[PDB]
């Protein structure tokens, strides 16, 4: 079953790329999970196609987020997650966005999405052009920085204490009574896992000649 099903998912996604060649750059499958690799100016048409086709009706934004790799020129990748509650299927959509350039917002289509978009905004600084009420959520109001970002340290920059003099809490640069001790320094120096086998069906890898 499961071998047949992952080989079926491969073919469905090959069809999805062939139906929209202008917008879809790649697709990758890894164990009954489908990721669609999409340009940032290509978000809105692909998401309308995912909402609207009868073969492809996902209807429901579950969760979206970014992830930074600082080693790439386009820093953040913005990943979307959908759930066709009709066809009982999940699909994933990745785009990219630098710190300063945007990605357009799907809150015109998906009504739940706006709250997710401003969450990923505060954690990552990734912009959603076309979005009412883009501002911070679930951090401090005067907070300077974006926390879930690799240049930002663990304990942050500031701390809070009650100054007696001003009769108010004051915000001060960071001083610890016990320093943070990461134990990541001390990982393995041998490669921990091998390369591993593949789950590609025989129909979708390139033929050898003769």
């Amino acid at each position: 079953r499961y071998l047949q099903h992952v080989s079926d998912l491969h073919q469905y996604a090959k069809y999805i790329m062939a139906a929209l060649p202008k917008y879809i750059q790649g697709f990758s499958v890894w164990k009954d999970e489908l990721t669609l690799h999409v340009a940032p100016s290509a978000v809105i048409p692909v998401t309308t196609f995912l909402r609207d086709n009868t073969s492809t009706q996902y209807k429901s934004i579950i969760d979206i987020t970014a992830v930074d790799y600082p080693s790439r020129e386009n820093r953040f990748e913005v990943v979307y997650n959908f759930l066709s509650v009709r066809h009982n299927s999940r699909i994933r959509l990745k785009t990219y966005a630098t710190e300063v350039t945007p990605v357009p917002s799907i809150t015109c289509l998906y009504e739940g999405a706006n709250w997710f978009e401003r969450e990923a905004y505060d954690m990552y600084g990734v912009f959603f052009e076309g979005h009412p009420d883009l501002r911070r959520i679930m951090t401090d109001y005067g907070f300077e920085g974006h926390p879930l970002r690799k240049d930002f340290p663990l304990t942050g920059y500031t701390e809070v204490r009650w100054d007696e003099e001003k009769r108010r809490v004051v915000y001060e640069p960071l001083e610890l009574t016990q320093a943070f001790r990461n134990f990541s320094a001390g990982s393995t120096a041998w490669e921990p896992v091998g390369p591993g086998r593949d789950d590609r069906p025989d129909s979708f890898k390139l033929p050898t000649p003769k």
Binding site: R161, D163, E164, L174, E175
Partner: protein, 263 residues
């Protein structure tokens, strides 16, 4: 990052000979190295005093009389900075115990009325004689005795008389003690109380304030009628401070037709 705007340096020597090195940058978590004992820190000036003093990490020894007036002094300092131990003016041994490891030590034990237990003579000259005899006994550097304005040795008032008496007795037994005399005080001429505490912390730590009487009086002189109409030696310039002015501190048809009202 927070800096020692407290200190002049990083390595300091006291008079008695102990070597004190500040650790880290100024801030709550650091330690300046000084140990200070503030008599009367439950009160109104001592609260601002060891607010400033335990801000950077001087280990403040707070002698307390009542257990409930002292509690808000716990949040002004780090782990191990502010230290509470009970004492009474009557029991010698508690005064002896409270100044064992102090580098500097101040009293602001001052009461404006007689009790059934202490008159003016009992808290101002005689308590100060007691604790400053202990300071002479342990050879603590930098003793500071805050006094009152108009502290005359012989006066019709008993309060001012005994403030002068306390000054004379503490100058007699310790020659190196410094006695500071502030103005009237308005926390929230008169002087603002954060200015008195800023002046006192700048008295606390430097050299060349030794055996010097200080007058801490604000910029412009007032009368009581002028104050109520507004409601309705060495000065500050020795220690590079400008006191705040009392007056600036003193505060511290058609649309309705086009709205809807009955819904």
């Amino acid at each position: 990052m927070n800096s020692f705007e407290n200190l002049a340096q990083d390595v300091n020597i006291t008079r008695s000979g102990k070597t004190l090195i500040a650790k880290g940058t100024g801030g709550r978590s650091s330690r300046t190295g000084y140990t200070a004992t503030v008599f009367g820190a439950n009160g109104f000036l001592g609260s601002y005093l060891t607010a400033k003093l335990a801000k950077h990490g001087t280990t403040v020894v707070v002698p307390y009389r009542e257990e409930m007036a002292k509690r808000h002094l716990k949040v002004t300092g780090d782990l191990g900075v502010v230290n509470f131990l009970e004492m009474d003016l009557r029991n010698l041994e508690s005064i002896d115990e409270a100044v064992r490891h102090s580098d500097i030590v101040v009293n602001l034990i001052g009461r404006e009325y007689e009790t059934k237990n202490f008159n003016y003579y009992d808290v101002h000259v005689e308590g100060a004689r007691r604790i400053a005899e202990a300071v002479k006994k342990h050879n603590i550097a930098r003793y500071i005795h805050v006094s009152a304005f108009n502290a005359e040795i012989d006066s019709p008032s008993e309060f001012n008389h005994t403030k002068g008496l306390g000054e004379q007795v503490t100058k007699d037994i310790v020659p190196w003690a410094t006695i500071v005399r502030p103005a009237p005080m308005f926390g929230r001429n008169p002087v603002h109380v954060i200015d008195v505490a800023a002046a006192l912390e700048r008295i606390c730590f430097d050299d060349s304030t030794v055996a010097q009487t200080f007058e801490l009086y604000g910029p412009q002189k007032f009368t009581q009628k002028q104050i109520i109409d507004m409601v309705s030696a060495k000065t500050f310039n020795d220690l590079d401070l400008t006191p705040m002015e009392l007056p600036d501190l003193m505060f511290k048809e058609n649309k309705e037709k086009t709205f809807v009202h009955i819904l």
